[PDB]
Design a protein around this nucleic acid. Structure first.
Ligand SMILES: [Mg+2]
Length: 132
DNA sequence: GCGAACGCG
DNA sequence: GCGAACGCG
């Protein structure tokens, strides 16, 4: 069933592409462990990808073997493949989201981890604790 | 390759 | 309606 000793991440989108925020919380308590301030233009899947990679970096900094829960099977696969397969144009308006994605891919390409990245089963378990 | 035909905000 | 992931020549 649920591994309560874990990190849960999720994205808050206003439009898609549109304003992106994300956060990571303690699955057990809902305590906010990290939060990303609004990024003016991104896609939902780019935000979910960034949330998982921020989680990987957060747990590594703290010598944690906790798994990560995401409700985004798309983003879980992007992280496994070390590539965010986004369609979003690269122009002046999207430079920030793409800089963050490119830096996240660089991190994945230059680090190893054991962190399990698990699917949060929303239908079966209810909303992920990191939900906005 | 051409375009059609989950889990949101 | 968005970003994701067939038959035909
Ligand atoms: Mg959510």
């Amino acid at each position: 069933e649920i591994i309560w000793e874990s990190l849960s991440v999720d994205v808050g989108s206003q439009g898609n592409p549109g304003i992106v925020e994300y956060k990571g919380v303690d699955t057990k308590t809902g305590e906010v462990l990290f939060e990303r301030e609004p990024i003016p233009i991104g896609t939902n899947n780019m935000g979910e990808f960034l949330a998982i990679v921020h989680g990987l970096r957060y747990l590594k900094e703290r010598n944690s073997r906790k798994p990560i829960y995401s409700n985004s099977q798309t983003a879980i696969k992007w992280v496994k493949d070390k590539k965010a397969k986004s369609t979003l144009v690269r122009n002046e308006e999207t430079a920030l989201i793409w800089k963050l994605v490119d830096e996240a891919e660089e991190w994945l390409n230059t680090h190893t981890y054991e962190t399990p990245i698990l699917k949060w089963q929303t239908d079966k378990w209810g909303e992920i604790k990191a939900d906005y």
